[PDB]
């Protein structure tokens, strides 16, 4: 199984530094060029830097040249991005990517990690409050029931939400965060059969990595 | 650097029809008998996925309904036939010169039949109330088209202050949208009114779809 696992994303103050790592497994790492690509909050993809299979050739986008250093350790099967002089514009999800290894010129990026999130801001990390959304007390019982949880007042993005630790996967809608007085809020809904709740347990699992928060909120009838 | 321009910015297409997406470069990206333009698909919550490399080569594992063509400064990605899980943003990217650069992307949307939303309303949780705040949450699930207008009423009067709306992207199976609409007000304000209504007006019906509760049951 080809895997590229990024780590190191965090909230950093302007002017600050940060080091990202990407652990490559399941292929011959030294046989491929590698790149970092980032996705900014406007959802645009932006190429950041590349490194040749042995590391003697590197190249950077105009935006990061002189501030970032890409490097690799083939024995460790690891790709690095050292960042410095961070600014608002560097806020993005950073993806580790593998280049195809065809001859006769340059190559497309054929495998991509899941990404690691970096935010550059003077604002402080704020953990979310998590509130259960159970139907109103006068609510009508139908064959279907929709539950939810409201994740409020956190910074920076992201939070992740799962239901019953992933078991409840279909019938889930998790909405994009919205800014509210400079903190983020989102909500997630899950729809399940009325026979299954409150008979069997339904729990929303909320993680906010930047504050090391993990909350499991049980949805209980009012 | 090489500037890549994609058009159109978005394209809406019925299931089974052809979609053609254009990428133009500020200079030729040809060399050595090849053209170095590659195409990627990006779906929400997922990293980009390689579709086509070096202008026309289909990446292993990608379905044959995706094809690329073009040369020098002018390239096209074609999807034929378009299927429900093709909802995504598509990007071109050149590697003929460093620094490597991406196009701005083209968002593919699916045209389908109208569908009424399923609406659910939730009073502020007791837990939030003890914290001193009050959010009333409304979910409008599985509807089409995207631009439903949600309206809030409190004791029968339209209420706009404190309302924030958020949409998911189009569902990769049924091609519908979902959204949340959240009314946030002080606990004081929440407690001095009785009836709370969220209303969806949508031309899948002449009557609004309504969900309401009374804080006094
Ligand atoms: C091959 C070429 O002309 N360009 C490729 C470029 O090469 C850089 C560099 O690669 C080797 O050095 P190390 O990787 O540092 O060992 C090579 N040495 C050899 C073959 O012994 C040098 O001669 C050469 O200058 O590297 C990038 C890799 O990212 C290539 O781009 P793609 O990955 O997209 O193909 C580029 O083709
Ligand atoms: Cl040849
Ligand atoms: Cl770019």
Tab-separated table of C-alpha atoms and ligand atoms in Angstrom:
chain	number	residue	atom	x	y	z
A	1	UNK	CA	0.000	0.000	0.000
A	2	UNK	CA	1.482	3.365	-1.076
A	3	UNK	CA	1.200	5.840	1.802
A	4	UNK	CA	2.369	9.421	2.307
A	5	UNK	CA	1.703	10.658	5.845
A	6	UNK	CA	2.233	14.338	6.632
A	7	UNK	CA	2.656	15.657	10.141
A	8	UNK	CA	3.589	18.950	11.755
A	9	UNK	CA	0.739	21.281	10.842
A	10	UNK	CA	-0.017	23.812	13.588
A	11	UNK	CA	-1.032	27.382	14.348
A	12	UNK	CA	2.010	29.679	14.126
A	13	UNK	CA	2.462	33.411	14.778
A	14	UNK	CA	3.431	35.683	11.827
A	15	UNK	CA	7.220	35.717	11.371
A	16	UNK	CA	7.393	32.237	12.896
A	17	UNK	CA	8.867	28.907	11.756
A	18	UNK	CA	7.469	25.421	11.335
A	19	UNK	CA	8.753	22.051	10.130
A	20	UNK	CA	6.573	19.579	8.227
A	21	UNK	CA	7.448	15.915	7.679
A	22	UNK	CA	6.077	13.336	5.265
A	23	UNK	CA	6.622	9.606	5.884
A	24	UNK	CA	6.633	7.600	2.656
A	25	UNK	CA	5.848	3.915	2.649
A	26	UNK	CA	5.056	1.108	0.233
A	27	UNK	CA	7.232	2.173	-2.710
A	28	UNK	CA	10.862	2.901	-3.658
A	29	UNK	CA	11.166	6.413	-2.181
A	30	UNK	CA	14.580	7.146	-3.695
A	31	UNK	CA	13.219	6.413	-7.192
A	32	UNK	CA	10.921	9.473	-7.336
A	33	UNK	CA	11.054	13.250	-7.279
A	34	UNK	CA	8.738	14.695	-4.595
A	35	UNK	CA	6.845	17.978	-4.176
A	36	UNK	CA	4.886	19.942	-1.581
A	37	UNK	CA	1.634	21.471	-2.842
A	38	UNK	CA	-0.669	23.616	-0.717
A	39	UNK	CA	-4.404	24.390	-0.820
A	40	UNK	CA	-5.265	27.892	0.439
A	41	UNK	CA	-8.625	28.768	2.077
A	42	UNK	CA	-9.923	29.950	-1.328
A	43	UNK	CA	-9.489	26.227	-2.323
A	44	UNK	CA	-6.824	27.056	-4.944
A	45	UNK	CA	-3.987	24.576	-5.438
A	46	UNK	CA	-0.557	26.177	-5.326
A	47	UNK	CA	2.722	24.378	-6.026
A	48	UNK	CA	5.316	25.078	-3.307
A	49	UNK	CA	8.587	23.190	-3.887
A	50	UNK	CA	10.154	20.090	-5.416
A	51	UNK	CA	13.180	17.873	-4.819
A	52	UNK	CA	14.856	15.365	-7.124
A	53	UNK	CA	15.182	11.689	-6.211
A	54	UNK	CA	18.670	12.132	-4.677
A	55	UNK	CA	18.100	15.666	-3.445
A	56	UNK	CA	20.742	17.577	-5.402
A	57	UNK	CA	18.125	19.617	-7.289
A	58	UNK	CA	15.474	21.678	-5.542
A	59	UNK	CA	13.144	24.437	-6.745
A	60	UNK	CA	10.621	26.743	-5.060
A	61	UNK	CA	7.618	28.884	-5.950
A	62	UNK	CA	8.353	32.627	-6.134
A	63	UNK	CA	6.251	33.117	-3.000
A	64	UNK	CA	8.369	30.873	-0.749
A	65	UNK	CA	11.852	31.084	-2.289
A	66	UNK	CA	14.319	32.187	0.362
A	67	UNK	CA	11.935	31.334	3.215
A	68	UNK	CA	11.258	27.579	2.836
A	69	UNK	CA	13.668	24.657	2.484
A	70	UNK	CA	12.650	21.323	1.036
A	71	UNK	CA	14.795	18.313	1.905
A	72	UNK	CA	14.668	14.524	2.094
A	73	UNK	CA	16.305	11.615	3.862
A	74	UNK	CA	16.055	8.561	1.643
A	75	UNK	CA	17.201	6.094	4.325
A	76	UNK	CA	14.386	7.402	6.540
A	77	UNK	CA	11.974	7.561	3.602
A	78	UNK	CA	11.001	11.033	4.751
A	79	UNK	CA	10.371	14.336	2.969
A	80	UNK	CA	10.679	17.624	4.880
A	81	UNK	CA	9.551	21.204	4.467
A	82	UNK	CA	11.204	23.760	6.762
A	83	UNK	CA	9.217	26.996	6.822
A	84	UNK	CA	10.334	30.393	8.161
A	85	UNK	CA	9.138	33.998	8.050
A	86	UNK	CA	5.592	32.663	7.921
A	87	UNK	CA	2.873	35.047	6.807
A	88	UNK	CA	-0.918	35.013	6.421
A	89	UNK	CA	-0.526	33.890	2.788
A	90	UNK	CA	1.101	30.635	3.931
A	91	UNK	CA	-2.100	29.498	5.665
A	92	UNK	CA	-3.106	26.323	3.806
A	93	UNK	CA	-3.387	22.578	3.837
A	94	UNK	CA	0.048	21.209	2.858
A	95	UNK	CA	0.189	17.996	0.817
A	96	UNK	CA	3.210	15.747	0.359
A	97	UNK	CA	3.150	14.364	-3.243
A	98	UNK	CA	5.109	11.805	-5.271
A	99	UNK	CA	6.182	12.455	-8.865
A	100	UNK	CA	5.745	9.687	-11.453
A	101	UNK	CA	9.106	8.394	-12.587
A	102	UNK	CA	8.823	8.328	-16.374
A	103	UNK	CA	11.835	9.327	-18.486
A	104	UNK	CA	11.633	11.736	-21.471
A	105	UNK	CA	11.003	14.812	-19.341
A	106	UNK	CA	9.123	15.850	-16.221
A	107	UNK	CA	6.263	14.111	-14.440
A	108	UNK	CA	2.836	14.582	-12.952
A	109	UNK	CA	2.138	14.014	-9.258
A	110	UNK	CA	0.651	10.528	-9.022
A	111	UNK	CA	0.187	10.083	-5.266
A	112	UNK	CA	-0.886	12.622	-2.615
A	113	UNK	CA	-1.044	12.473	1.170
A	114	UNK	CA	-4.146	13.540	3.091
A	115	UNK	CA	-2.498	16.838	3.995
A	116	UNK	CA	-1.587	18.729	7.161
A	117	UNK	CA	-3.115	22.069	8.109
A	118	UNK	CA	-1.049	25.165	8.827
A	119	UNK	CA	-2.494	28.457	10.072
A	120	UNK	CA	-0.493	31.651	10.423
A	121	UNK	CA	-2.211	34.074	12.785
A	122	UNK	CA	-1.679	36.225	15.885
A	123	UNK	CA	-4.972	34.907	17.293
A	124	UNK	CA	-4.810	32.218	20.015
A	125	UNK	CA	-5.868	28.547	19.866
A	126	UNK	CA	-9.398	28.219	21.287
A	127	UNK	CA	-10.978	24.799	21.987
A	128	UNK	CA	-14.561	24.146	20.761
A	129	UNK	CA	-17.677	23.790	22.888
A	130	UNK	CA	-19.704	20.761	21.734
A	131	UNK	CA	-23.488	20.729	22.152
A	132	UNK	CA	-25.809	17.778	21.461
A	133	UNK	CA	-28.783	18.401	19.143
A	134	UNK	CA	-31.662	16.123	20.116
A	135	UNK	CA	-35.195	16.689	18.742
A	136	UNK	CA	-37.438	19.105	20.666
A	137	UNK	CA	-39.471	17.590	23.524
A	138	UNK	CA	-42.765	17.947	21.606
A	139	UNK	CA	-41.262	16.480	18.411
A	140	UNK	CA	-43.161	13.995	16.271
A	141	UNK	CA	-41.904	10.416	16.041
A	142	UNK	CA	-41.557	9.291	12.448
A	143	UNK	CA	-39.776	6.277	10.943
A	144	UNK	CA	-36.665	8.452	10.507
A	145	UNK	CA	-34.941	10.648	13.112
A	146	UNK	CA	-32.280	13.327	12.474
A	147	UNK	CA	-29.824	14.187	15.263
A	148	UNK	CA	-26.904	16.579	15.343
A	149	UNK	CA	-24.206	18.322	17.236
A	150	UNK	CA	-23.122	21.905	17.198
A	151	UNK	CA	-19.392	22.624	17.457
A	152	UNK	CA	-18.889	26.212	18.472
A	153	UNK	CA	-16.250	28.841	19.188
A	154	UNK	CA	-12.989	27.257	18.080
A	155	UNK	CA	-9.787	28.460	16.419
A	156	UNK	CA	-8.069	27.593	14.145
A	157	UNK	CA	-9.662	25.144	11.709
A	158	UNK	CA	-9.949	22.249	11.436
A	159	UNK	CA	-12.170	20.110	13.591
A	160	UNK	CA	-13.161	16.629	12.492
A	161	UNK	CA	-16.536	15.102	13.383
A	162	UNK	CA	-17.471	11.428	13.309
A	163	UNK	CA	-20.584	9.569	14.472
A	164	UNK	CA	-20.278	6.421	16.660
A	165	UNK	CA	-16.524	6.460	15.951
A	166	UNK	CA	-17.100	6.065	12.215
A	167	UNK	CA	-19.715	3.259	12.350
A	168	UNK	CA	-22.458	5.745	11.516
A	169	UNK	CA	-21.108	6.967	8.163
A	170	UNK	CA	-24.037	7.146	5.744
A	171	UNK	CA	-26.730	9.759	6.372
A	172	UNK	CA	-24.120	12.161	7.791
A	173	UNK	CA	-23.813	15.784	6.637
A	174	UNK	CA	-21.050	17.859	8.173
A	175	UNK	CA	-21.206	21.496	7.099
A	176	UNK	CA	-18.330	23.922	6.378
A	177	UNK	CA	-17.338	26.080	9.328
A	178	UNK	CA	-18.458	29.670	9.411
A	179	UNK	CA	-16.761	32.551	11.220
A	180	UNK	CA	-18.624	33.987	14.232
A	181	UNK	CA	-16.916	36.866	16.062
A	182	UNK	CA	-13.551	35.591	14.813
A	183	UNK	CA	-14.151	32.015	16.028
A	184	UNK	CA	-15.415	29.118	13.915
A	185	UNK	CA	-18.686	27.183	14.309
A	186	UNK	CA	-20.013	24.178	12.443
A	187	UNK	CA	-22.686	21.544	12.871
A	188	UNK	CA	-23.095	17.952	11.742
A	189	UNK	CA	-26.337	16.041	11.260
A	190	UNK	CA	-26.969	12.291	11.186
A	191	UNK	CA	-30.189	10.581	10.094
A	192	UNK	CA	-30.957	7.051	11.412
A	193	UNK	CA	-34.094	4.880	11.866
A	194	UNK	CA	-36.271	5.768	14.890
A	195	UNK	CA	-36.013	2.117	15.945
A	196	UNK	CA	-32.277	2.604	16.512
A	197	UNK	CA	-32.485	5.720	18.689
A	198	UNK	CA	-32.737	6.307	21.599
A	199	UNK	CA	-32.798	2.471	21.851
A	200	UNK	CA	-29.173	2.181	20.797
A	201	UNK	CA	-26.538	4.810	21.591
A	202	UNK	CA	-25.592	7.620	19.143
A	203	UNK	CA	-22.496	9.690	19.863
A	204	UNK	CA	-20.712	12.449	17.986
A	205	UNK	CA	-16.938	12.422	18.178
A	206	UNK	CA	-15.274	15.808	17.843
A	207	UNK	CA	-11.533	16.371	17.591
A	208	UNK	CA	-9.698	19.680	17.445
A	209	UNK	CA	-6.009	18.781	16.973
A	210	UNK	CA	-4.652	22.302	17.523
A	211	UNK	CA	-5.929	22.272	21.136
A	212	UNK	CA	-5.594	18.497	21.609
A	213	UNK	CA	-9.361	18.377	22.250
A	214	UNK	CA	-11.287	15.141	22.002
A	215	UNK	CA	-14.976	15.144	22.934
A	216	UNK	CA	-17.519	12.358	22.653
A	217	UNK	CA	-20.993	13.827	23.078
A	218	UNK	CA	-23.892	11.407	23.601
A	219	UNK	CA	-27.185	12.509	22.000
A	220	UNK	CA	-29.890	11.981	24.619
A	221	UNK	CA	-33.627	12.657	24.413
A	222	UNK	CA	-34.756	15.859	26.126
B	1	UNK	CA	6.407	31.869	-14.653
B	2	UNK	CA	3.961	30.074	-16.895
B	3	UNK	CA	0.398	31.306	-16.319
B	4	UNK	CA	-2.388	28.749	-16.813
B	5	UNK	CA	-5.918	29.978	-17.482
B	6	UNK	CA	-8.866	27.608	-17.072
B	7	UNK	CA	-12.333	28.064	-18.485
B	8	UNK	CA	-15.110	27.986	-17.822
B	9	UNK	CA	-14.920	28.662	-14.054
B	10	UNK	CA	-17.845	26.342	-13.559
B	11	UNK	CA	-19.848	24.091	-15.812
B	12	UNK	CA	-23.187	22.469	-15.059
B	13	UNK	CA	-23.994	19.286	-17.014
B	14	UNK	CA	-26.814	16.693	-17.015
B	15	UNK	CA	-25.885	13.110	-16.179
B	16	UNK	CA	-24.718	11.226	-19.273
B	17	UNK	CA	-23.749	14.308	-21.257
B	18	UNK	CA	-20.230	15.430	-22.270
B	19	UNK	CA	-18.212	18.000	-20.318
B	20	UNK	CA	-15.304	19.801	-21.984
B	21	UNK	CA	-12.940	21.900	-19.889
B	22	UNK	CA	-10.197	24.160	-21.275
B	23	UNK	CA	-6.681	25.037	-20.043
B	24	UNK	CA	-4.506	27.554	-21.872
B	25	UNK	CA	-0.847	28.354	-21.121
B	26	UNK	CA	0.982	31.681	-21.481
B	27	UNK	CA	3.663	29.806	-23.415
B	28	UNK	CA	4.249	26.373	-24.914
B	29	UNK	CA	4.634	23.493	-22.478
B	30	UNK	CA	5.874	21.079	-25.183
B	31	UNK	CA	9.324	19.383	-25.110
B	32	UNK	CA	10.975	16.180	-26.362
B	33	UNK	CA	7.888	15.131	-28.328
B	34	UNK	CA	5.634	15.392	-25.237
B	35	UNK	CA	3.317	18.087	-23.806
B	36	UNK	CA	3.706	18.608	-20.074
B	37	UNK	CA	0.192	19.475	-18.932
B	38	UNK	CA	-1.430	17.219	-16.335
B	39	UNK	CA	-5.011	17.106	-15.000
B	40	UNK	CA	-6.244	16.483	-11.466
B	41	UNK	CA	-9.615	15.904	-9.876
B	42	UNK	CA	-10.383	17.256	-6.432
B	43	UNK	CA	-13.402	16.259	-4.354
B	44	UNK	CA	-14.198	17.849	-0.956
B	45	UNK	CA	-12.387	16.325	2.033
B	46	UNK	CA	-10.055	14.496	-0.353
B	47	UNK	CA	-6.604	15.265	-1.754
B	48	UNK	CA	-6.329	15.926	-5.486
B	49	UNK	CA	-6.170	12.813	-7.704
B	50	UNK	CA	-4.188	12.506	-10.947
B	51	UNK	CA	-6.401	11.878	-13.958
B	52	UNK	CA	-4.270	12.564	-17.040
B	53	UNK	CA	-0.500	12.987	-17.343
B	54	UNK	CA	1.467	14.576	-20.185
B	55	UNK	CA	-1.654	15.926	-21.878
B	56	UNK	CA	-3.241	12.693	-23.090
B	57	UNK	CA	-2.140	9.724	-21.000
B	58	UNK	CA	-4.832	8.191	-18.807
B	59	UNK	CA	-3.540	7.387	-15.325
B	60	UNK	CA	-3.898	3.763	-14.276
B	61	UNK	CA	-7.111	3.205	-12.337
B	62	UNK	CA	-8.897	6.212	-13.878
B	63	UNK	CA	-12.004	5.406	-15.982
B	64	UNK	CA	-11.769	5.715	-19.784
B	65	UNK	CA	-14.549	8.324	-19.881
B	66	UNK	CA	-11.818	10.810	-18.925
B	67	UNK	CA	-9.575	11.889	-21.803
B	68	UNK	CA	-7.116	14.717	-22.415
B	69	UNK	CA	-5.951	16.364	-25.614
B	70	UNK	CA	-4.140	19.413	-26.895
B	71	UNK	CA	-0.614	20.676	-27.420
B	72	UNK	CA	1.705	23.660	-27.014
B	73	UNK	CA	-0.491	26.237	-25.260
B	74	UNK	CA	-3.977	24.776	-25.673
B	75	UNK	CA	-5.414	21.776	-23.754
B	76	UNK	CA	-8.760	20.190	-22.984
B	77	UNK	CA	-10.031	17.659	-20.490
B	78	UNK	CA	-13.133	15.797	-21.671
B	79	UNK	CA	-15.517	13.774	-19.515
B	80	UNK	CA	-17.943	11.642	-21.511
B	81	UNK	CA	-20.236	10.465	-20.240
B	82	UNK	CA	-20.480	12.514	-17.038
B	83	UNK	CA	-21.509	10.424	-14.029
B	84	UNK	CA	-22.766	11.363	-10.577
B	85	UNK	CA	-19.447	10.857	-8.780
B	86	UNK	CA	-17.641	13.219	-11.173
B	87	UNK	CA	-18.786	16.215	-9.133
B	88	UNK	CA	-15.440	17.892	-8.331
B	89	UNK	CA	-13.082	20.722	-9.172
B	90	UNK	CA	-10.635	19.918	-12.000
B	91	UNK	CA	-7.206	21.511	-12.279
B	92	UNK	CA	-4.566	21.658	-14.955
B	93	UNK	CA	-0.900	21.955	-13.997
B	94	UNK	CA	2.260	22.386	-16.065
B	95	UNK	CA	5.672	20.861	-15.342
B	96	UNK	CA	7.580	21.985	-18.470
B	97	UNK	CA	9.195	24.790	-16.514
B	98	UNK	CA	10.096	25.359	-12.861
B	99	UNK	CA	8.437	26.913	-10.929
B	100	UNK	CA	5.592	24.511	-11.622
B	101	UNK	CA	2.123	26.076	-11.748
B	102	UNK	CA	-1.566	25.212	-11.541
B	103	UNK	CA	-4.642	26.574	-13.292
B	104	UNK	CA	-7.368	28.087	-11.115
B	105	UNK	CA	-9.707	25.128	-11.514
B	106	UNK	CA	-13.088	24.350	-13.043
B	107	UNK	CA	-15.964	23.248	-10.805
B	108	UNK	CA	-18.192	20.571	-12.348
B	109	UNK	CA	-21.815	20.595	-11.211
B	110	UNK	CA	-24.545	18.053	-12.011
B	111	UNK	CA	-27.911	19.133	-13.420
B	112	UNK	CA	-30.801	16.992	-12.200
B	113	UNK	CA	-34.499	17.053	-11.331
B	114	UNK	CA	-35.898	19.313	-8.607
B	115	UNK	CA	-36.029	17.772	-5.106
B	116	UNK	CA	-37.661	19.152	-1.928
B	117	UNK	CA	-35.514	19.418	1.225
B	118	UNK	CA	-36.153	17.420	4.358
B	119	UNK	CA	-36.206	19.960	7.179
B	120	UNK	CA	-35.316	19.426	10.877
B	121	UNK	CA	-35.239	22.065	13.654
B	122	UNK	CA	-33.436	21.925	16.994
B	123	UNK	CA	-33.940	24.184	20.024
B	124	UNK	CA	-30.807	25.332	21.868
B	125	UNK	CA	-29.442	22.482	24.017
B	126	UNK	CA	-29.857	22.949	27.778
B	127	UNK	CA	-26.082	22.737	28.020
B	128	UNK	CA	-25.628	25.724	25.716
B	129	UNK	CA	-28.281	27.624	27.649
B	130	UNK	CA	-26.442	27.201	30.963
B	131	UNK	CA	-23.397	28.588	29.151
B	132	UNK	CA	-25.394	31.738	28.434
B	133	UNK	CA	-25.975	31.420	24.671
B	134	UNK	CA	-28.716	30.174	22.351
B	135	UNK	CA	-28.416	28.729	18.850
B	136	UNK	CA	-31.436	27.417	16.973
B	137	UNK	CA	-30.317	24.979	14.288
B	138	UNK	CA	-32.181	24.025	11.098
B	139	UNK	CA	-30.989	21.319	8.678
B	140	UNK	CA	-32.326	21.233	5.127
B	141	UNK	CA	-31.200	17.948	3.628
B	142	UNK	CA	-31.129	16.460	0.127
B	143	UNK	CA	-32.594	19.183	-2.084
B	144	UNK	CA	-32.096	20.585	-5.618
B	145	UNK	CA	-31.366	23.185	-6.983
B	146	UNK	CA	-28.788	24.712	-4.644
B	147	UNK	CA	-30.265	28.186	-4.178
B	148	UNK	CA	-33.106	27.474	-1.778
B	149	UNK	CA	-33.991	30.496	0.335
B	150	UNK	CA	-34.338	29.872	4.056
B	151	UNK	CA	-36.222	32.367	6.183
B	152	UNK	CA	-36.507	32.493	9.966
B	153	UNK	CA	-39.509	33.739	11.923
B	154	UNK	CA	-39.804	34.396	15.608
B	155	UNK	CA	-43.356	34.696	16.989
B	156	UNK	CA	-44.463	35.102	13.358
B	157	UNK	CA	-42.081	37.959	12.409
B	158	UNK	CA	-39.273	37.563	9.837
B	159	UNK	CA	-35.867	37.498	11.523
B	160	UNK	CA	-32.547	38.003	9.693
B	161	UNK	CA	-30.138	39.185	12.355
B	162	UNK	CA	-27.980	36.392	13.731
B	163	UNK	CA	-28.569	33.949	10.840
B	164	UNK	CA	-25.671	32.023	9.228
B	165	UNK	CA	-26.002	29.463	6.450
B	166	UNK	CA	-23.657	26.781	5.229
B	167	UNK	CA	-23.881	24.360	2.271
B	168	UNK	CA	-22.261	20.998	1.622
B	169	UNK	CA	-21.052	20.315	-1.880
B	170	UNK	CA	-23.212	18.278	-4.261
B	171	UNK	CA	-23.689	14.661	-3.118
B	172	UNK	CA	-21.645	12.212	-5.203
B	173	UNK	CA	-24.587	9.740	-5.436
B	174	UNK	CA	-27.891	11.608	-5.677
B	175	UNK	CA	-26.456	14.940	-6.805
B	176	UNK	CA	-28.390	16.904	-4.176
B	177	UNK	CA	-27.300	19.620	-1.756
B	178	UNK	CA	-27.756	19.952	2.001
B	179	UNK	CA	-27.391	23.072	4.152
B	180	UNK	CA	-27.571	24.207	7.762
B	181	UNK	CA	-29.179	27.440	8.845
B	182	UNK	CA	-28.358	28.602	12.357
B	183	UNK	CA	-30.024	31.417	14.263
B	184	UNK	CA	-27.820	32.637	17.096
B	185	UNK	CA	-29.166	35.033	19.687
B	186	UNK	CA	-28.587	35.883	23.351
B	187	UNK	CA	-30.165	33.606	25.965
B	188	UNK	CA	-32.124	36.696	27.142
B	189	UNK	CA	-33.543	37.225	23.662
B	190	UNK	CA	-34.262	33.522	23.158
B	191	UNK	CA	-36.204	33.372	26.398
B	192	UNK	CA	-38.488	36.340	25.634
B	193	UNK	CA	-40.085	34.719	22.580
B	194	UNK	CA	-42.154	31.567	22.110
B	195	UNK	CA	-42.478	30.404	18.488
B	196	UNK	CA	-39.396	29.652	16.328
B	197	UNK	CA	-39.783	28.766	12.659
B	198	UNK	CA	-37.400	28.015	9.827
B	199	UNK	CA	-39.015	28.079	6.395
B	200	UNK	CA	-37.691	26.852	3.072
B	201	UNK	CA	-39.086	28.445	-0.056
B	202	UNK	CA	-38.238	26.456	-3.149
B	203	UNK	CA	-39.969	26.071	-6.521
B	204	UNK	CA	-40.484	22.336	-5.970
B	205	UNK	CA	-43.663	23.630	-4.286
B	206	UNK	CA	-45.809	26.778	-4.132
B	207	UNK	CA	-46.228	26.465	-0.337
B	208	UNK	CA	-43.187	26.914	1.923
B	209	UNK	CA	-41.805	23.869	3.754
B	210	UNK	CA	-41.970	24.772	7.449
B	211	UNK	CA	-40.485	23.505	10.705
B	212	UNK	CA	-41.297	25.106	14.000
B	213	UNK	CA	-41.375	24.611	17.753
B	214	UNK	CA	-42.754	26.537	20.696
B	215	UNK	CA	-40.434	27.060	23.666
B	216	UNK	CA	-43.567	26.708	25.851
B	217	UNK	CA	-44.502	23.357	24.189
C	1	LIG	C1	16.670	14.408	-15.569
C	1	LIG	C2	16.425	15.846	-15.806
C	1	LIG	O1	16.951	16.392	-16.785
C	1	LIG	N1	15.687	16.497	-14.941
C	1	LIG	C3	15.032	15.906	-13.779
C	1	LIG	C4	15.609	16.501	-12.491
C	1	LIG	O2	16.925	16.084	-12.369
C	1	LIG	C5	17.634	16.649	-11.354
C	1	LIG	C6	18.919	15.829	-11.081
C	1	LIG	O3	18.597	14.539	-10.739
C	1	LIG	C7	19.653	13.688	-10.400
C	1	LIG	O4	20.300	14.053	-9.153
C	1	LIG	P1	19.905	13.478	-7.803
C	1	LIG	O5	18.572	13.317	-7.892
C	1	LIG	O6	20.263	14.510	-7.029
C	1	LIG	O7	20.652	12.349	-7.741
C	1	LIG	C8	20.597	13.593	-11.647
C	1	LIG	N2	21.688	12.674	-11.365
C	1	LIG	C9	21.769	11.441	-11.869
C	1	LIG	C10	20.717	10.971	-12.834
C	1	LIG	O8	22.663	10.671	-11.570
C	1	LIG	C11	21.078	14.936	-12.089
C	1	LIG	O9	21.761	14.760	-13.276
C	1	LIG	C12	19.853	15.851	-12.300
C	1	LIG	O10	20.206	17.139	-12.487
C	1	LIG	O11	14.909	16.065	-11.378
C	1	LIG	C13	13.537	16.174	-11.360
C	1	LIG	C14	13.064	15.166	-10.254
C	1	LIG	O12	12.198	15.786	-9.619
C	1	LIG	C15	12.840	15.726	-12.648
C	1	LIG	O13	11.486	16.096	-12.677
C	1	LIG	P2	10.318	15.001	-12.576
C	1	LIG	O14	10.410	14.417	-11.306
C	1	LIG	O15	9.086	15.704	-12.761
C	1	LIG	O16	10.514	14.101	-13.666
C	1	LIG	C16	13.548	16.142	-13.927
C	1	LIG	O17	13.051	15.370	-14.993
C	2	LIG	CL1	12.670	8.237	-27.332
C	3	LIG	CL1	0.733	27.253	-8.619
